[PDB]
UniProtKB/Swiss-Prot annotation:
Belongs to the WAL family. Expressed at varying levels in several tissues, whereas a smaller transcript was expressed specifically in testis. It is found in: Nucleus. Regulatory subunit of the ATP-dependent BRF-1 and BRF-5 ISWI chromatin remodeling complexes, which form ordered nucleosome arrays on chromatin and facilitate access to DNA during DNA-templated processes such as DNA replication, transcription, and repair. Both complexes regulate the spacing of nucleosomes along the chromatin and have the ability to slide mononucleosomes to the center of a DNA template. The BRF-1 ISWI chromatin remodeling complex has a lower ATP hydrolysis rate than the BRF-5 ISWI chromatin remodeling complex. It comes from the Eukaryota. This is Bromodomain adjacent to zinc finger domain protein 2B. The gene is BAZ2B. The chain holds residues 2054 to 2166 of 2168 of the full protein. Residues 9-113 form the Bromo domain. Component of the BRF-1 ISWI chromatin remodeling complex, at least composed of SMARCA1 and BAZ2B, which regulates the spacing of histone octamers on the DNA template to facilitate access to DNA. Within the BRF-1 ISWI chromatin remodeling complex interacts with SMARCA1; the interaction is direct. Component of the BRF-5 ISWI chromatin remodeling complex, at least composed of SMARCA5/SNF2H and BAZ2B, which regulates the spacing of histone octamers on the DNA template to facilitate access to DNA.
């Protein structure tokens, strides 16, 4: 509350550390369904079904241009990629499995880096 603050967690490395995590996600072998925006002209149903498309290249542009106010807003866009994936793809598909693997990979890096 006013003039009463919890001790200040050091957030000065967050930008760099999120960038690293993102690089690791970009270079994982199962990243291929997530590297670029889904092409809304060419994938029937995507535009109408997925309210908020997200992909690693778009996350990378937002990051580089100061559009994440903090590390939680970055984690929300990453998780959005995998939530979108689960919404549109069967678990038993290559893309569905990809998304499950990438989320697992992300969540471990997130906890080891910050928690």
């Amino acid at each position: 509350s006013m003039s009463v603050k919890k001790p200040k967690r050091d957030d000065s490395k967050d930008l760099a550390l999120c960038s690293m995590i993102l690089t690791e996600m970009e270079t994982h072998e199962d990243a291929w369904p997530f590297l670029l925006p889904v092409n809304l002209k060419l994938v029937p149903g995507y535009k109408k079904v997925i309210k908020k498309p997200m992909d690693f290249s778009t996350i990378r542009e937002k990051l580089s241009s100061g559009q994440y106010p903090n590390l939680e807003t970055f984690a929300l866009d990453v998780r959005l990629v995998f939530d979108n994936c689960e919404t549109f793809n069967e678990d038993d598909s290559d893309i569905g499995r990809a998304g499950h693997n990438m989320r697992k990979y992300f969540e471990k890096k997130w906890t080891d880096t910050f928690k």
